[PDB]
Amino acid sequence: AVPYNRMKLMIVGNTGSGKTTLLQQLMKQSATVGIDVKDWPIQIRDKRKRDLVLNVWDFAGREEFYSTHPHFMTQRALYLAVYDLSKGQAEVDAMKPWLFNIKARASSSPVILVGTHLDVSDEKQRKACMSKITKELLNKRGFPAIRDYHFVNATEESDALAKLRKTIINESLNFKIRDQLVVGQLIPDCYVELEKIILSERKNVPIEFPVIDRKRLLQLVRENQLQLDENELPHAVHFLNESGVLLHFQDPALQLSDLYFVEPKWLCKIMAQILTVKGIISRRDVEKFLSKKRKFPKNYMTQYFKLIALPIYLLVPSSLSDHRPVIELPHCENSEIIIRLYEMPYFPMGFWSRLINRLLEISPYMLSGRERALRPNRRYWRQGIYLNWSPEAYCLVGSEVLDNHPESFLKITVPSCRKGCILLGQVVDHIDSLMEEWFPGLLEITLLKKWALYSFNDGEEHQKILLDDLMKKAEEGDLLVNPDQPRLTIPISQIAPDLILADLPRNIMLNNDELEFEQAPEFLLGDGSFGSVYRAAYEGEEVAVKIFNKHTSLRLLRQELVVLCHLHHPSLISLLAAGIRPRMLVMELASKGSLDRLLQQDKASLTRTLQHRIALHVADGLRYLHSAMIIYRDLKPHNVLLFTLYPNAAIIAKIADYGIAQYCCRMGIKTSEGTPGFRAPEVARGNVIYNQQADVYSFGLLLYDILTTGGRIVEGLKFPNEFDELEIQGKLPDPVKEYGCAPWPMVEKLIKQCLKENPQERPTSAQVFDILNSAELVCLTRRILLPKNVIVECMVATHHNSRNASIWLGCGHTDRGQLSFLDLNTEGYTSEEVADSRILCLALVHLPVEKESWIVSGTQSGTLLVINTEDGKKRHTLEKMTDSVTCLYCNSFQKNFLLVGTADGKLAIFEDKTVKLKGAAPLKILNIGNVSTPLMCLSESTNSTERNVMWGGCGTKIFSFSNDFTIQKLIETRTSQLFSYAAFSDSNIITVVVDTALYIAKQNSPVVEVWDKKTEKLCGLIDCVHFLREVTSYSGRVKTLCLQKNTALWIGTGGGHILLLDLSTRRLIRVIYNFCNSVRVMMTAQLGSLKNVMLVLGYNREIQSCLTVWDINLPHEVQNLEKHIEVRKELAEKMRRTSVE
Ligand SMILES: COc1cc(C(=O)N2CCC(N3CCN(C)CC3)CC2)ccc1Nc1ncc2c(n1)N(C)c1ccccc1C(=O)N2C
Ligand SMILES: Nc1nc2c(ncn2[C@@H]2O[C@H](COP(=O)(O)OP(=O)(O)O)[C@@H](O)[C@H]2O)c(=O)[nH]1
Secondary structure, three states: OOEEOEEEEEOOEOOOOOHHHHHHHHHOOOOOOOOOEEEEEEOOOOOOOOOEEEEEEOOOOOHHHHHOOHHHOOOOEOOOOEOOOOOOOHHHHHOHHHHHHHHHHOOOOOOOEEOOOOOOOOOHHHHHHHHHHHHOOOOOOOOOOOOOEEOOOOOOOOHHHHHHHHHHHHHHHHOEEOOEEOOOEEOOHHHHHHHHHHHHHHOOOOOOOOOEOHHHHHHHHHHHOOOOOOOOHHHHHHHHHHHOOOEOOOOOOOOOOOOEEOOHHHHOOHHHHHHOOOOOOOOHHHHHOOOOOOOOOOOHHHHHOOOOOOOOOOOOHHHOOOOOOOOOOOOOOOOOEEEOOEEEOOOOOOHHHHHHHHOOOOOOOOHHHOOOOOOOOOOEEOOEEOOEEEOOEEOOOEOEOOOOOOOEEOOOEEEOOHHHHHHHHHHHHHHHHHHHHOOOOOOOOOOOEEEEEEOOOOOOOOEEEEHHHHHHHHHHOOEEEOOOOOOOEEEOOOOOOOOOOOOOOOOOOOOOOOEEEOOOOOOEOOOOOOEEEEEEEEOOOOEEEEEEOOOOOHHHHHHHHHHHOOOOOOOEOOEEEEOOOOOEEEEOOOOOOEHHHHHHHOOOOOOOOHHHHHHHHHHHHHHHHHHOOEOOOOOOOOOEEEOOOOOOOOOOEEEOOOOOOOEOOOOOEOOOOOOOOOOOHHHHOOOOOEOOOHHHHHHHHHHHHHHOOOHHHHHHHHOHHHHHHHHHHOOOOOHHHHOOOOOOOOOHHHHHHOOOOOHHHOOOHHHHHHHHOOHHHOOEEEEEEOOOOOOEEEEEEOOOOOOOOEEEEEEOOOOOOEEEEEEOOOOEEEOOEOOOOOEEEEEEEEEOHHHEEEEEEEEOOOOOOEEEOOOOOOOOOOOOOOOOEEEOOEEEOOOEEEOOEEOOOEEEEEEHHHOOOOOOOOOEEEEOOOOOOOEOOOOOEOOOOOOOOOOEEEOOEEEOOOOOOOOOOEEEOOOOOOOOOOOOOOOOEEEEEEOOOEEEEEOOOOEEEEEOOOOOOEEEEEEHHHHHOOOOOOOOOOOEEEEOOOOEEEEEOOOOOEEEEEOOOOOEEEEEOOOOOOEEEEEEEEEOOEEEEEEEEEEEOOOEEEEEEEOOOHHHHHHHHHHHHHHHHHHHHHHHHHHHO
């Protein structure tokens, strides 16, 4: 819409050049600490161009501030350059580090070089050097687009600055980015409106910490609604970030997405305060760095911002000593040390701050923190480090300048011993890891040149050989021959030990005499990103040989070794040998192929148990990898190798193909390597830096593929373009609804929790394994939520085993009995008002004659509704009991009988064959108790098929009956022997289950009583709250009780807990919670030839009654899993211990 005449201006230069005083003359000064931001309203007299306003920055020239400048140096700018002329011609050459860094970070930027001090300096000498470098700049590929040059006088307003100012305004209008003019570019009016509110809020934002969260910005934009949207806001924020009026850091590694900085000048001043408030540091900085340090002003804001001080307690990169401290090496013999100079054209801006930060780990001899070695006598200075463990094991990474060489070096000074070779192997890997991630400009194709120093004889000249030439000589032979005479030779293991893989442990090395290998394309096991895998025999075994191709440097091979020869785990593949002469790695053999071959062509052996261990083992490997500061980035259902398809085994899954695995420290990673279709959203974009949590999204996609049995991969094979776009976006479909899989209610919760767009909301790899370690995650098949505000007190499962799996619910949320039909495989809920009063309990009666199926109902009024299961117009009521009906349990001795439990202790037996009559009479009305004692405790005996005695309970009494319909026992329960637990023993009985003894539950009774049927005495008193005391008047009731056949006892508490008691003697197997608020009804059902389901109905309290379906195999699963985890804990410790030893 309206033109946007805003441009950001940057002024760079070395200290003493006069960058600030130059700006002062144009806009018409002891030092420029930090960065000084200004506004420059300039009017273009020529034509009718809008009055330009320039956000001028005054980048400091003092060498201590150079570490944090590049982060505030971005595109959309017109960089100046100031060089002093009193120095002569060396000052122009001294600007070269400044010029190189500008082009590296700001590729499209019209740099103008501006001189100074014309009053007391010459120009002819400077012009000779200035013209030479710019002629050498157009053919350098590292310099910026220098398209001007000037010489400017002192602070007095002379004619020279008039030309300089005219140049800047002309250059800014001539500036073009993406073939479009930056100054005056068209822009939507909404973005300009957002700029206005930010400026207004900048004036009243707190000065101690100026920032607004996402909530504040959301509230402001909502009440304005200046033609904005919810998805156009990130575009608006990013555009304002480029201009320079709102700094937003959306990098997932930084975790600063929520915060919106509305004060760019404040952000560049914090670094100045830290510096000006060495070898020795004190606690003064963390205590009284500024007057804003207090309890509340330094609690919420301090957790938001971090900026290299690892907790110990402060060591900033800019306070280190300028010059190298005095040091003395144990020896200086030319044949006792190893030197690995890195000749580079220029030190990158902030290179040494990161390298010093990275090399502050202490585990070079026991990787992954297996054994924290002795703290070395570390020495600190601006460009270098001096880790020193022993007089025979030291490293001296540090800068060095040689005579007649304007370039910079990176001298390593490791010793020529076994511990010297180990250190050089790791230091070089970490240096190459930094320059691959953070400084790709140096590794651009060949600016960097790596030299290895060797000396045939001590005392002679210490010569140089380019390392790539040594690599070609190393592959043709293991010895170095002197061209002058072959009499004297030195090995390659003393010049470049890492070249010939001499730093690896002696346990793994290619003994090429017991290795029977055939490269013929018949023993082929697959392919890979950079190699091929072949079958082979190593020391009389079966191995998989990874052989690399011609287009592969040793850096690629070493990138795999750092994760393979240092980390040992049952879920990570391991090496047996590694050579360089044929350039192969010898790996373990996955017996039954990669997981992809199982998903597609073997969709018959994937049970719900095997799928869990595969997801568990991969998340187990990720937890170890992420705990060793290593990211994977290549998690696909191709790299998950299976060793055996047995649900109960020590090792099942395994992770391989560590081809693009690189270290991911607290600074994060920047490269975007990966496989299309399996990448996290942050990995898909190439403009952000992501942390290790980006790998969790990749695991979630793998877990998504496991659940759907590779449905997504097959669908994406037809349209690869949509495969990458949909996975990266995150609008993935619901798995159970579309692809047609068996429901898994709380791994779909895990998938939707670890696939969130915001990386901070994704669970850590250590938390995903904890969730997957839940033993109830395997045996919870289904979970249904009933409609809002329904109170169902009874249920029954239609058990014909072949007709239809359905649940019949008697609702009670209204004062009129509603009998509801629930279709389990469809989740179709329908109700029907059939009774005047609430229905208390239901029961299914099945007559084998004529295949008639009927269900009986019990109402509080007293009626007994009977309706056919299939026919909906077969209602016929029986004669009403004296009082309410509470239990209708039906079982056969022979003859099918329908026991009726009336609320006045009156059990009237009714004949199942008599249900067809529309109104009948009880066969024999037996009396157990009076009206005051309810009879609501019917049960049966499942032991030894003893369908003779049917133990029940009336009030606080125990009763029984047989086919003779006589009471064989009437046992009193009101009296308590201990006389202390009588309060919870003075309530009426609820439910009884019998296997060999009697288990008694009472209202509001946290105790369950075990009574022997032979001695009529309470054998045991199990206190439920005793078992809940470890996990927590109290919500520890016993509202339902179900007894599995011969394995365990399921006790359901009123607080939503489920107790699995080991039926052997006493043991508590497990306690289950965080899924329901009040368990009400529990029973065992069988559904669709898939038996062993324990229907648990509870209210998730607005009352949401949840009907979750478990497996009665759970008491075995909880014990099986913990033994399985315990075994893999021993293997993990054994493998790590033997490696570190
Ligand atoms: C017995 O071990 C495996 C067998 C199979 C497999 O089912 N076949 C079936 C038939 C097929 N060929 C038959 C003969 N010819 C016609 C060519 C085609 C290939 C082999 C597939 C994989 C097997 N095991 C295996 N272990 C370790 C790996 C790895 N893979 N490779 C290929 C890797 C793949 C991905 C990531 C890492 C690796 C890996 O590093 N290693 C060491
Ligand atoms: N470049 C320049 N500097 C001058 C001149 N006359 C005096 N100076 C001094 O140079 C200093 C310039 O400081 P400056 O380099 O801008 O500080 P910095 O931005 O922190 O490096 C001022 O403090 C002046 O006292 C002049 O003619 N040219």
